[PDB]
Design a protein around this ligand. Structure first.
Ligand code: HEM
Ligand code: HEM
Ligand SMILES: Cc1cc(N)nc(C[C@@H]2CNC[C@@H]2OCCCCCc2cccc(N)n2)c1
Ligand SMILES: Cc1cc(N)nc(C[C@@H]2CNC[C@@H]2OCCCCCc2cccc(N)n2)c1
Ligand SMILES: C[C@H](O)[C@H](O)[C@H]1CNc2nc(N)[nH]c(=O)c2N1
Ligand SMILES: C[C@H](O)[C@H](O)[C@H]1CNc2nc(N)[nH]c(=O)c2N1
Ligand SMILES: [Zn+2]
Lengths: 407, 411
């Protein structure tokens, strides 16, 4: 009931107390650790509301004041009456910033308090959703000078009227099974691409086709919309030394924007809440390009470098991985699109951890997601012990809507 | 109960029943995961249960469960415990035990090899000098002129915890670290504290960047004694690079034999506080950690300087670049000298095959993801994408505190 984390590179020891305020369940027991698993009424709602408003009023230094006891009473009466309640704009902004603050898998949280929140709770149609989302994309992109933002559609009511963005991210590339047997474009999105085509989409059947948004308002069947191309900022990938790199024909998008998550604030569930920041280089160059199940480009790059691909021990995979990531970084920087490298991002996260320990009593962190997918041990997060626990407000993963929705 | 693990690259789903045989604690709760925390005298009362579990397991493994030989051995151990407070393992049980501790070691990526382990029974040992002889024979057997063979040497078990055998070195072979008055370190920073104990015990330090440390050995709870491993027994590899001819002039070398000596082996309730074991290196242990940790030899800058990498900002990935070249060098050098080494691609691939086999035949394989994933190039190895269940099985290896913090000095 008082826990220590040690950094093994610097010997700095931090003391966590924030974990006692933790509420949801981790997946682990005394007997089994699930640290590496990807997915481990009225009466229910008032405690959840209360817990939230208590933290909110404490943050603005008005815990136990009349404005506190009055809001607690107002919310209580509204739940009693309507079976739900509405958040004040101030509460909504706070909840959103804190769900990011609490996101244990996010390395970029030094940035948590600079989050532009777009209140789309007044939305009612898929066309409305499209308008809001285009406005979010343009605001956040900001001609390459990226700004963090979230747009929050209306909360869950009876659960049969959910707003959902069916895309997993606002901007992604299509994937198509080929006669060949192989895959064209991004294999992650084969299924979704089919759902779009089975719902009307005219696919260009290219390697890098920006998918249509597929939007669900008020539990209705979802509809298709193309994001204005002038709003989707893309980056052709070149290398600062390798002439031939450009000829691979690689590009990626500047805006990472997760839109399949569920934002939970004071017991309320916001099932459509796309949010966006900016990239860490490795997300694109290590994962998007190199994962066997993704664009899987290592072989082709290794060939152009003329490495010895005969034996794994020549580290040809590793050598090519580094250059691919140098090129991702160099291209974003040259075209002036915000990107951070894993050295700088993990160094920032250590600074943020220390702020959160002295200021808040801790910082939940999932080491398995926080340490970059390349060069783990030469980044400082490798040597930092972390405690992982679930705080609310939070972002939660939710099932793909096609698996659920009735048509 | 059944727990499933998915591999997100292949969609292969495995079912773990083995976790049901797990007994000890993880450190985690339903409220906190301590998966990245590095560290998350027995009565009769406790002992016979631990013995019984163990012998039930051993007897099952030989398909003799419930045999007269099994029941007679249970009775015998019961009696030995009731009358003497402890018991002695048969050779066959010791061997099986040491094999299964390695098999159960969830942080070890090398476990495909668990059944081929040479066990040296050193339970007749009585003196530090005896321990020294035993360790020499182990080093020479394991080294085998570069054709490394896994081995373990097992000294007498704990009795009252006042009479422990301990190897004070954390590994049998390691380099001296020396703190300089100006605050720099010469040689290996990890070993500064232990080097200082050695010096105080009378070791004459050469004060070089790569001095092999003397063994400091404790028998029967006595004060530790110093011994120099014969140099002809310490196989070393000079580090050079296939294309970069200046690599050799950095003056690096490493020892071929990774040999962990500070861990405690538990078999059937008995505690073997000195049980050095050895295998062979995966290249990244040396090339990533030993050379490139900031708290170790820290050679990234010097390498990148020689390579003329752009070092003015991190986003040139100069560190990532230098790190790969060094790792290339370590594997090249070992291979050229015919010293057994495995790369992290081949090791993780073998591990996944081992792991799947273990689910089919054993009903699980406990694995610590934080340690199994290599410290470079994580996601281009198949373990990154592998969900893993971590739990504790016995027989087992455990961390124990360094003996210089606990030892009662006799004078
Ligand atoms: C501003 C720059 C940001 C950086 C550099 C960054 C970095 C990252 C990275 C590298 C990951 C792991 C992604 C992966 O490997 O798939 C991640 C995950 C995550 N981040 Fe951030 N992030 C940023 C902004 C944001 C914002 C604005 C939010 C929410 C407001 C957020 C919340 C999350 C969540 C919930 C996850 C886990 C996603 C999942 O479970 O699939 N992050 N972050
Ligand atoms: C045969 C070749 C072997 C290879 C390639 C191998 C590989 C490794 C590696 C890379 C680690 C992580 C160590 C680190 O990064 O510091 C490790 C840990 C470990 N291995 Fe192995 N291993 C081998 C043999 C053995 C043997 C023979 C045993 C005992 C019989 C053993 C038991 C352990 C234990 C207990 C750990 C955790 C050590 C700790 O917590 O400090 N391994 N293995
Ligand atoms: C099964 C599953 C669970 C879960 N919690 N998340 C996922 C999505 C997978 C996990 N890793 C890659 C993929 O998600 C991509 C998420 C987008 C990246 C997150 C992000 C958000 C904001 C900024 C930024 N730089 N990066 C999948
Ligand atoms: C605090 C602590 C706990 C714990 N369980 N282990 C340690 C020792 C740390 C862990 N990683 C670096 C350092 O020890 C070196 C590990 C020894 C190598 C393991 C090994 C054995 C046999 C063969 C091989 N290739 N590798 C430290
Ligand atoms: C099985 C394992 O949990 C899975 O591969 C995780 C590992 N760490 C990760 N880390 C990040 N940042 N993103 C991921 O998608 C994953 N995948
Ligand atoms: C804090 C963290 O658990 C610690 O630095 C671990 C991470 N993973 C590791 N993995 C291996 N193989 N060896 C190690 O020493 C470590 N150190
Ligand atoms: Zn856990």
């Amino acid at each position: 009931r008082f826990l220590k984390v040690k950094n093994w590179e610097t010997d700095v020891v931090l003391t966590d107390t924030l974990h006692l305020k933790s509420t949801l369940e981790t997946g682990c027991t005394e007997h089994i650790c699930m640290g590496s698993i990807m997915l481990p009424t009225k009466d229910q709602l008032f405690p959840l509301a209360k817990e939230f408003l208590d933290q909110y009023y404490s943050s603005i230094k008005r815990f136990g004041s009349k404005a506190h006891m009055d809001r607690l009473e107002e919310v209580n009466k509204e739940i009693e009456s309507t079976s739900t309640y509405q958040l004040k704009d101030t509460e909504l902004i706070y909840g959103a910033k804190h769900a990011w603050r609490n996101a244990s898998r996010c390395v970029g949280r030094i940035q948590w308090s600079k989050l532009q929140v777009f209140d789309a709770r007044d939305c009612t149609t898929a066309h409305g959703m499209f308008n809001y989302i285009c406005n979010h994309v343009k605001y956040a992109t900001n001609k390459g000078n990226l700004r963090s933002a979230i747009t929050i559609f209306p909360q869950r009511t009876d659960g049969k009227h959910d707003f959902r963005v069916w895309n997993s991210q606002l901007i992604r590339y299509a994937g198509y099974k080929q006669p060949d047997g192989s895959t064209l474009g991004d294999p992650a999105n084969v299924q979704f691409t089919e759902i779009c085509i089975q719902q009307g989409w005219k696919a260009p059947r290219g390697r890098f086709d920006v998918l249509p948004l597929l939007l669900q308002a008020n539990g209705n069947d979802p509809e298709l919309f193309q994001i204005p191309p002038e709003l989707v900022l893309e980056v052709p990938i070149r290398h600062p030394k390798f002439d031939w790199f450009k000829d691979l024909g690689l590009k990626w998008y500047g805006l990472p924007a997760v839109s399949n998550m569920l934002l939970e604030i004071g017991g309320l569930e916001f099932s459509a809440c796309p949010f966006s920041g900016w990239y860490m280089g490795t997300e694109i160059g290590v994962r998007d390009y190199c994962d066997n199940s993704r664009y899987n480009i290592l072989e082709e790059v290794a060939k152009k470098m003329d490495l010895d691909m005969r034996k794994t021990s020549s580290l040809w995979k590793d050598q090519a991985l580094v250059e691919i990531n140098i090129a991702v970084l160099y291209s974003f920087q040259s075209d002036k699109v915000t990107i951070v490298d894993h050295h700088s991002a993990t160094e920032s996260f250590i600074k943020h951890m220390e702020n959160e320990y002295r200021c808040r009593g801790g910082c939940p962190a999932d080491w398995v997601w926080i340490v970059p997918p390349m060069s783990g041990s030469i980044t400082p997060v490798f040597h930092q012990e972390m405690l992982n626990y679930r705080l609310t407000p939070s972002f939660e993963y939710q099932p793909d809507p096609w698996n659920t929705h009735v048509w």
